[PDB]
Amino acid sequence: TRPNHTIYINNLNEKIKKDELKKSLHAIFSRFGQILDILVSRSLKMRGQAFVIFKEVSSATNALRSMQGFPFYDKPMRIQYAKTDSDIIAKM
RNA sequence: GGCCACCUGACAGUCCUCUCC
RNA sequence: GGAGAGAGAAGUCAACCAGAGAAACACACCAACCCAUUGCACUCCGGGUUGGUGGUAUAUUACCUGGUACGGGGGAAACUUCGUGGUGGCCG
Ligand SMILES: [Ca+2]
Ligand SMILES: [Ca+2]
Ligand SMILES: [Ca+2]
Ligand SMILES: [Ca+2]
Ligand SMILES: [Ca+2]
Ligand SMILES: [Ca+2]
Ligand SMILES: [Ca+2]
Ligand SMILES: [Ca+2]
Ligand SMILES: [Ca+2]
Ligand SMILES: [Ca+2]
Ligand SMILES: [Ca+2]
Ligand SMILES: [Ca+2]
Ligand SMILES: [Ca+2]
Ligand SMILES: [Ca+2]
Ligand SMILES: [Ca+2]
Ligand SMILES: [Ca+2]
Ligand SMILES: [Cl-]
Ligand SMILES: [Cl-]
């Protein structure tokens, strides 16, 4: 898709608690640039995925290109740019 | 006076519907 | 959103008033487990089983304690003990 401030990540272990998941995600993604927020929900449709919103697109492209397949709670995570701007980015 | 089913009421943390703020 | 009024599921209960008073059943949350889900969101929220916890359910309907009204039976009397929402089928 088009490069975006937010990266879409799926194929995440569904047994992991939300706080635990957001925390690990920040730990392994913080190095690419400031992270504005990370949305994770365990609802039927949103479980196994998470949105990581970066402050700079350049930071999103870096994380995407460098963490594709990263081992994570026993599953190789899949990453893509989000199809649409996350609200906080669109509302600026 | 017992046991089972249906009747009919009392109770009305869910659900519906209507009015008011 | 709050309040209230109808309708009313589940479940328990039965003459009348009242004190005391559970349970059952719905519902909500949490945990474990099972099934389903590879899903593009930004207003929360899939189903199942087992267990735990919760509530102006701080209720009431059982159980108990007081009387009321009907009926019985017992007292010489001053009174006292029992019973109590409709049918059909098995039964006493
Ligand atoms: Ca964060
Ligand atoms: Ca959930
Ligand atoms: Ca008005
Ligand atoms: Ca009924
Ligand atoms: Ca009655
Ligand atoms: Ca009472
Ligand atoms: Ca009580
Ligand atoms: Ca709630
Ligand atoms: Ca609810
Ligand atoms: Ca699975
Ligand atoms: Ca699919
Ligand atoms: Ca939106
Ligand atoms: Ca579940
Ligand atoms: Ca469940
Ligand atoms: Ca209670
Ligand atoms: Ca009471
Ligand atoms: Cl969680
Ligand atoms: Cl979130």
What is the number of alpha carbons within 13 Å of residue A8 lying toward its C-beta? 13
Round to a whole number and report the distance in Å from the CA of A57 to the C1' of C48: 44
Query: Strand pairing partners for A34?
Result: none
* Smallest CA–C1' separation from A86, nucleotide: C42
**Contact, A60 vs A6, CB < 8 A?**
yes
Tell me, in Å, the resolution of the deposited structure.
Answer: 2.4
Experimental technique used to determine this entry:
X-ray
Round to a whole number and report the distance in Å from the CA of A33 to the C1' of C88: 81
- Domain around A2: 1-92
CATH classification of the domain holding A78: 3.30.70.330
Classify residue A37 by burial, with Cβ atoms within 10 Å: 0-12, 13-18, 19+. middle
Residues 6+ away with beta carbon under 8 Å from A31:
none
Domain count, chain A: 1
